[PDB]
Design a protein around this ligand. Structure first.
Ligand SMILES: *[C@@H]1O[C@H](CO)[C@@H](O[C@@H]2O[C@H](CO)[C@@H](O[C@@H]3O[C@H](CO[C@H]4O[C@H](CO)[C@@H](O)[C@H](O)[C@@H]4O)[C@@H](O)[C@H](O)[C@@H]3O)[C@H](O)[C@H]2NC(C)=O)[C@H](O)[C@H]1NC(C)=O
Ligand SMILES: *[C@@H]1O[C@H](CO)[C@@H](O[C@@H]2O[C@H](CO)[C@@H](O)[C@H](O)[C@H]2NC(C)=O)[C@H](O)[C@H]1NC(C)=O
Ligand SMILES: *[C@@H]1O[C@H](CO)[C@@H](O[C@@H]2O[C@H](CO)[C@@H](O)[C@H](O)[C@H]2NC(C)=O)[C@H](O)[C@H]1NC(C)=O
Ligand SMILES: *[C@@H]1O[C@H](CO)[C@@H](O)[C@H](O)[C@H]1NC(C)=O
Ligand SMILES: [Zn+2]
Ligand SMILES: [Zn+2]
Ligand SMILES: [Zn+2]
Ligand SMILES: [Zn+2]
Ligand SMILES: [Zn+2]
Ligand SMILES: [Zn+2]
Lengths: 391, 387
């Protein structure tokens, strides 16, 4: 009757630990019911590797736990896929990127941050490059025993705020905050075990010796950051000075030298120089300018934001019947941000086109089969299925 | 008989401590002996605040040393200027910005850096942002007593920006401890790192895709023309990756790799430029790659040549209604905005070439060309006589 249609596909990124292991599933339907075949991204089938990779009873790729010594790259750190197939044609899933990571002991360095009294500060949990993806801050803790818990910012009103980007924001530091010391404890999203910071950060408060220029923590006059759609994103202004200055956030109008001021809502909030875009959307993207002036002068810093949305695609029509000699067109409709490549596939084999509209002019008995459009950006991809028929 | 021009033009930026003190001197030229007046940037004149600001004889301005408590902003941190006058009119001295520093007893933290063996790492001893305008790192030291040095053997290297670079990080390197010595440029007072940097060497096991220190895909940087400039690439991968630095073309997606030679060198992921030119200014790209993966980061760069200029002709005479023109020959990088002023009065034109084909009776006097940018400046003048 019909061709294979993908129901449950795995996720673009599958990460796990050598102690846990993983078993991933792929589901397709149609008449006759297709059989699920596991393959690499280049379309080559994968066999067992006893102790590492084994295909189980029903259509399920398994990665049992393993010694750190038994780690094998081509098995664990790999690009995978899922192939559903029957009489009509074949289809491939979105590329499934597996990275299995052995448990590797890590430590968090809470950095002492220099400040002038009256200025607000943000102190950071320094985390190594390699665990940064798998680890984040569970909470903040001081020497006095007060836990500062991380939160979506509904209420930005308070002395202490733990913001979603993982830092601890303190409004207008003073002597009372001077002899307090702070720990950050982090959680591994695979293991789920918590670890306190080894070194404790402390606020070092200088006094308004002079009156000076605004000074950012770095010489960088431009930055960039990325955030998801539903996430609460945090831009930063780390500017420091005396006398304590005021912050103004602006957003650039695209492709021109003309700026515009950021409108604050119960959605968009400001704390010190910290801008909070909480409950974001793609249109929040653009070039931003933080501007801090004081009595002695002023300086400014650019920031490039890009909001990403989940890639999804649907082919119109899911199926169509045509007669020999008549044109048959397929149109791939997509969402998510950003987009780089849209590409077409036939029965598992590629067709060079960058266009969302696939147009065959005169059908052939050759052209009968299954069609797919592949939408992709660096960190993500998606798969929509389609069938062709003849008369 | 004739009008003024600037012979002695004090430095654009002046810094000094409370213990040292400082002084400035400004002459020009011309006839009769020009009135040398010191003015704050907006043309209001400035008098004495004795003990700090007072005008010494010769019409020169001195800043005597002072205690910390007596400090007041308007005199110390401020932008001053200078002006000369005859019947020929006035001319303004360029941007002078002045600062003074009370001793904060600066502290410097040596930051622990966590690394997978085989990967080259950069160590930064972090100086606070406010004092960083002066203090720099002269030397680095470890537990063994090893003295490193600026270097403007090929393993351990300190850069012109002051950080310490290590390549092929081994187990021999990590279980040491590191600390840096910082010297202040307005005093000469040195000091040793408060804390001691520990290098944690982690055992590579599972293969890791290249990751950077921060999520930011871009950075900006700049330096003087004659300076040796560094471009950081901080990347850690297992397998240890290979860093290839490209360079873009202005406002285009076009790309080319770069020319490794005597002036433009490379160490690990670090692209180093020796004594440079404004022609090196541009937008670069750092791509890191290994078997598992790897990604890219781009770095903006600028080079700054000194601002200077003059007007052609330096002087001329004209027939009352006959054309008179002045063009500003400019150099230095970047060049933001040229500005014209009549006897210090601000009269706008954005063109390097300004002309008057119709002369009034009152246009007799001095004229200037101000070449300006964010923090920097230069000035030169010309004058038209009516005959
Ligand atoms: C996945 O790979 C991991 C290594 O990358 C494996 O974990 C390691 O396993 C070895 C021995 O199998 C442990 O060494 C033992 O340590 C215990 C004491 O406990 C340890 O406690 C923590 C670990 O969380 C830490 O403080 C120290 O490493 C302690 O050693 C001793 O009693 C033993 O005699 C032996 O020395 C490693 O400690 C451990 N590393 C970890 C957990 O980070 C893990 O077993 C692998 N999984 C599978 C399924 O093979
Ligand atoms: C705050 O400081 C910024 C610079 O850090 C000022 O922005 C511009 O600065 C350039 C060069 O310094 C000038 O050419 C522009 O004219 C400035 N902008 C404007 C709109 O004039 C900014 O003006 C300062 N704002 C305040 C209130 O001090
Ligand atoms: C070097 O790393 C890049 C980053 O993944 C590899 O991939 C290309 O990266 C460029 C950006 O510099 C993109 O424009 C291309 O689309 C990427 N192509 C692919 C196939 O990923 C690149 O292949 C690496 N170079 C090698 C392996 O020689
Ligand atoms: C400059 O200020 C510091 C601040 O403590 C002080 O110790 C020093 O004596 C001052 N210098 C003079 C010359 O008074
Ligand atoms: Zn992919
Ligand atoms: Zn630090
Ligand atoms: Zn799909
Ligand atoms: Zn200036
Ligand atoms: Zn650190
Ligand atoms: Zn001059």
């Amino acid at each position: 009757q019909k061709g294979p249609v993908f129901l449950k596909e795995p996720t673009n990124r599958i990460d796990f630990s050598n102690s846990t292991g993983a078993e991933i599933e792929c589901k397709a339907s149609g008449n006759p019911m297709p059989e699920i075949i596991w393959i690499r991204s280049d379309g080559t089938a994968v066999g067992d590797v006893p102790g590492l990779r084994q295909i189980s009873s029903d259509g399920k790729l398994v990665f049992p736990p393993f010694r750190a010594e038994d780690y094998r790259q081509e098995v664990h750190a790999q690009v995978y896929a899922c192939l559903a197939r029957n009489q009509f044609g074949s289809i491939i899933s979105r590329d499934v990127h597996v990275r299995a990571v052995v448990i590797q002991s890590y430590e968090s360095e809470a950095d002492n941050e220099y400040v002038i009294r009256g200025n607000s500060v943000v102190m950071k949990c320094e985390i190594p490059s390699y665990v940064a993806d798998f680890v984040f801050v569970d909470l903040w803790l001081d020497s006095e025993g007060r836990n500062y818990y991380p939160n979506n910012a509904a209420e930005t009103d308070g002395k202490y705020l733990v913001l979603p980007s993982g830092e601890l924001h303190i409004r207008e530091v003073g002597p009372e905050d001077g002899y307090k010391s702070y720990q950050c404890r982090t959680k591994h999203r695979l293991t789920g075990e918590t670890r306190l910071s080894a070194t404790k950060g402390r606020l070092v408060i200088t006094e308004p010796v002079g009156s000076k220029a605004p000074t950012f923590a770095t010489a960088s006059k431009i930055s960039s950051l990325l955030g998801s759609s539903s996430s609460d994103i945090v831009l930063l202004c780390q500017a420091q000075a005396f006398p304590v200055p005021y912050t103004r956030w602006y957003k650039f109008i695209e492709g021109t030298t003309r700026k515009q001021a950021v409108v604050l809502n119960d959605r968009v909030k400001q704390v010190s120089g910290t801008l909070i875009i909480k409950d974001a959307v793609v249109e929040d993207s653009g070039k931003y300018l933080c501007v801090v002036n004081n009595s002695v002068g002023g300086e400014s810093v650019e920031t490039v934001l890009t909001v990403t949305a989940p890639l999804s695609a649907k082919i119109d029509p899911p199926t169509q019947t045509v007669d020999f000699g008549r044109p048959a067109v397929f149109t791939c409709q997509y969402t998510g941000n950003p987009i780089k490549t849209v590409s077409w596939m036939k029965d598992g084999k590629a067709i060079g086109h960058s266009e969302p509209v696939l147009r065959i002019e005169s059908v052939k008995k050759e052209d009968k089969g299954m069609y797919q459009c592949f939408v992709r950006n660096d960190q993500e991809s998606a798969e929509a299925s389609a069938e062709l028929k003849l008369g």
